[PDB]
Symmetry: D2
Subunit: 144 residues, 4 copies
């Protein structure tokens, strides 16, 4: 609502998960990953209060936490999608680039790349499809 | 700008004072008032960092602090513009209404009224024209 | 939507009437008026097609049409609300100000003034409350 | 800007070319292509007036015109970037997908792919870097 919504990158399996709020700021990402992306969880701010979205996806893999500093925000996201074992098409890797540093890559960068550089705007939330892994991924952006 | 900008209410004396960037949350207002509005100062959040705008205007009158709680936000602003002494058109009064309570009125409700009820959106910042008193006033809003 | 929605100015009688489209351009206003505002109708554009909203209100008074030229857009709206005979609070007058000329005032400028100068943004649609007359009025804005 | 601006895909050579203001509707694309993308030109609407952006880029290749019907809009863009001749990273191919049909691919789909599926929003304009070819490419999006 007032946000541009990009997606989906990835396949059709899993179950859709999406936000119900009105995010103004992305404060933290928790990503689980191994040979692909296992799960996503993120916190966002609405009317001065923090909300937790997720966890979406399974408890496999290893956990990594991205917690943005004051004045730090994402300027790009990259990743790859493709098959893993019996799953036809899922999210194999993700990389998050802020104005201060790069986080990742998480997962293995097999399959078809995608990339979202942001020239004017802010990334404030995510959605996707999830089962035991991240089947598909999308992004919410606010104009700057 | 990604923000809708309303204004100006008032005259054309004084310094045009404005913010840069794209505030996403208004946290605090400090207002000085007596027979008119003397000064405005407000804190806002951008990219997780708090900034202080102002003080804009002089040190006349009496000071009042409005501090918004998490989950509290403005739903309307009212005011009046008119003459005071030798200044033909400045800001005589302001009232701030949140979802929780009403703050004010501040100043004296003499002159021409104005009113900005918000049915969908968030007030995140202000601008105006300022000398010894508040000569003109405006509002920044983002979609909700 | 990604629109800021301002309102309501006026009273609580009549029926709320609104849009749910995705307007990107206000093309035309048809207004009926006499001692107050009798009715409102407007057209907007979405994906290069024109859509008619309204008519909201009664068939009294006389009709005027405001059709904007290419390159012409509203920079302000003014009006007044107040009693008309036995009605406590309805829309008594409206004035539409574009970057090229002023349309109105329509009705009689009795009652409490309101005014919406737009410093950055575009007015793309309206809503309100309506019976035989225009009981209340509001405005949709997109950022510029 | 009230528009989300994505980019740049491609390299750092050539000269930046961009629009001003806030387009609200994309009406036409003319693209020149052969081994890569040679040039881009597009028509857009702002405040009810149609403007021409470009042509940006060179005179080589062959020309194709995409004329959007009323009710037709882009739902996705895909492309590829990579080296060619004296240029280390430029735009090798572009594909434009509307709600009615697919236009392209133009150029040669050699190099690193990118893809922008729009789940909620409208593509209204483009920008990039240009010399005799299209060195880099970006996209303006409006909330829907």
């Amino acid at each position: 609502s007032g946000l541009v919504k990009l997606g989906l990158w990835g396949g059709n399996e899993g179950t859709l998960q999406d936000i119900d709020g009105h995010p103004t700021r992305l404060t933290k990402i928790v990503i689980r990953s191994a040979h692909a992306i296992d799960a996503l969880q993120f916190d966002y701010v609405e009317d001065g209060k923090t909300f937790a979205a997720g966890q979406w996806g399974g408890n496999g893999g290893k956990s990594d936490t991205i917690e943005f500093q004051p004045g730090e925000y994402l300027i790009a996201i990259k990743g790859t999608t493709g098959a893993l074992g019996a799953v036809t098409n899922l999210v194999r890797s993700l990389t998050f680039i802020s104005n201060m540093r790069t986080y990742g890559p998480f997962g293995l960068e097999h399959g078809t790349p995608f990339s979202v550089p942001v020239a004017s705007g802010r990334i404030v939330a995510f959605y996707g499809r999830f089962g035991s892994l991240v089947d598909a991924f999308g992004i919410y952006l606010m104009p700057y």
